[PDB]
Amino acid sequence: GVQVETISPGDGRTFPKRGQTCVVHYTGMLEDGKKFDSSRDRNKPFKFMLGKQEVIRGFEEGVAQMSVGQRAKLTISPDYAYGATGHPGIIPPHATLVFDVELLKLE
Numbered sequence: 001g002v003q004v005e006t007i008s009p010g011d012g013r014t015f016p017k018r019g020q021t022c023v024v025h026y027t028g029m030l031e032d033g034k035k036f037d038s039s040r041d042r043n044k045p046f047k048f049m050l051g052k053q054e055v056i057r058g059f060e061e062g063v064a065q066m067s068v069g070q071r072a073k074l075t076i077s078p079d080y081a082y083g084a085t086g087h088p089g090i091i092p093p094h095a096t097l098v099f100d101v102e103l104l105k106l107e
């Protein structure tokens with residue numbers, strides 16, 4: 001559902017716990033295509049809490065398997081992203097998404 005390829009290793013010890021707030025930087029693009037979003041450009045990190053169904057499955061599960069300081073390429077299949085519906089006006093149906101994610105801190 002989500003493939004994680006390391007860009008920079010984390011500490012390999014400190015992983016997100018259930019219900020924790022993850023602070024990340026991300027850039028999102030359609031597979032081999034258009035970049036639709038980046039938190040790095042506006043220089044403001046993205047925050048979300050696990051176990052609250054706040055983000056797409058592939059993003060949550062991608063971040064959950066990362067340790068603090070890790071940067072990774074997340075390749076997310078449509079079923080773990082926006083599926084057959086897509087995301088209105090931005091993500092088409094059946095889109096494989098690629099996210100560059102860095103886990104900055106846990107809070």
Ligand SMILES: CO[C@H]1C[C@@H]2CC[C@@H](C)[C@@](O)(O2)C(=O)C(=O)N2CCCC[C@H]2C(=O)O[C@H]([C@H](C)C[C@@H]2CC[C@@H](O)[C@H](OC)C2)CC(=O)[C@H](C)/C=C(\C)[C@@H](O)[C@@H](OC)C(=O)[C@H](C)C[C@H](C)/C=C/C=C/C=C/1C
Pocket residue numbers: 026028036037046048053054055056057059087090091
């Ligand atoms: C302007 O920038 C947007 C994010 C944009 C939207 C459009 C997409 C292309 C994108 O560019 O992000 C994007 O790159 C993307 O696909 N993302 C964002 C990064 C994490 C992964 C993914 C995602 O899941 O987006 C999310 C996706 C679009 C929708 C969710 C997908 C999972 C599903 O379970 C949810 O249904 C419940 C809906 C958007 C978010 O990450 C934000 C944080 C979360 C929500 C909006 C909902 O979870 C909401 O439910 C009411 C909440 O619980 C929140 C916390 C309550 C408060 C008031 C809302 C804050 C809204 C913040 C919105 C932000 C920063």
